[PDB]
Amino acid sequence: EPAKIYINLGVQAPGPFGGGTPEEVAATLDRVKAAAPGIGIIVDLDEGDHRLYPEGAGRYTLAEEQAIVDHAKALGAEICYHLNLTVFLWTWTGLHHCIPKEKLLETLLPQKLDELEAAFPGKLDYVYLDRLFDGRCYDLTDEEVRYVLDLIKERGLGIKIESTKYLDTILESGVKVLVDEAVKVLDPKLFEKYPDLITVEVLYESIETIERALAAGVRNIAIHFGGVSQLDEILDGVRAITENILA
């Protein structure tokens, strides 16, 4: 069967350097689908008594986040939610302070996951956490990894990982994975053992980036462009898929 194609798209709140309101994000997503027809869309999103007005620009409110997802979900786009606040604020410093491993496994991570699916019921496909990131914080044991994967698979979520440190246990757990290769290594043996589970995000440098990927297994490839400014920059290479075919 032919392979799948997606346009990995980053969305953030209006701030000092860019961003767009839920109306602007909705219009851009409609303009991408208007050009790219049979191409999937992967929208990345960062997390923002609980607001209505954003406490400081550069972050969305929970309503604006829901308004974007509900519009992107209606377009058929998959949502990948970034739970970076798992290291946010020992405190009163804005650092990436790491709570004890128990405090995170026992309480916060299930807490954040419950809050997650409470705000976006069944409308999130992948979730990103800065824990499997080559270890960094905490050295995860054998059962510790598969416990976090169980919390994610419980709520029907996939995972986005930057490091392929634990990829050889994620696929055994049968959970969909999103490998961000937009600047480790991986053998094509995985694509014949787990074809419908891996989706590789690549930095678009040319058609040679796709051909090098399609030469292996990669039946699910997401394209992330370098560069609301990017509306037209993506509308340049959006014709790079009508003629690409390659199926």
Author numbering: 3 to 50, 58 to 59, 61 to 99, 116 to 209, 220 to 263, 267 to 286
What text does the study give?
dEngBF4 crystallized in two different space groups, P212121 (form 1) and P61 (form 2), and the crystal structures of the protein were determined using the molecular replacement method described in Materials and Methods. Form 1 has two protein molecules, 1A and 1B, in the asymmetric unit, whereas for form 2 one protein molecule is present in the asymmetric unit, resulting in three separate structures. All three structures aligned with an RMSD of 1.0 Å or less, revealing a common (β/α)8-barrel organization with an overall fold similar to the hallucinated model. Likewise, another extended loop region including His91-Lys127 harboring the two tryptophan residues, making up the tryptophan lid in EngBF, displayed both low pLDDT confidence scores and flexibility in the molecular dynamics simulation. The movement of this loop, however, is constrained due to the formation of a disulfide bond between Cys124 and Cys163 residues, potentially contributing to the observed high thermostability in dEngBF4. While ProteinMPNN proved to be highly effective in improving the pLDDT confidence score, certain loop regions remained unrecoverable, which correlated with regions displaying poor or no electron density in the crystal structure. Enzymatic assays of the dEngBF proteins with Galβ(1–3)GalNAcα1-para-nitrophenol as a substrate showed no measurable para-nitrophenol release during the designated incubation period (data not shown).
Here, we present a strategy for the de novo design of a simplified scaffold of an endo-α-N-acetylgalactosaminidase active site, a glycoside hydrolase from the GH101 enzyme family. Using a combination of trRosetta hallucination, iterative cycles of deep-learning-based structure prediction, and ProteinMPNN sequence design, we designed proteins with 290 amino acids incorporating the active site while reducing the molecular weight by over 100 kDa compared to the initial endo-α-N-acetylgalactosaminidase. Of 11 tested designs, six were expressed as soluble monomers, displaying similar or increased thermostabilities compared to the natural enzyme. Despite lacking detectable enzymatic activity, the experimentally determined crystal structures of a representative design closely matched the design with a root-mean-square deviation of 1.0 Å, with most catalytically important side chains within 2.0 Å.
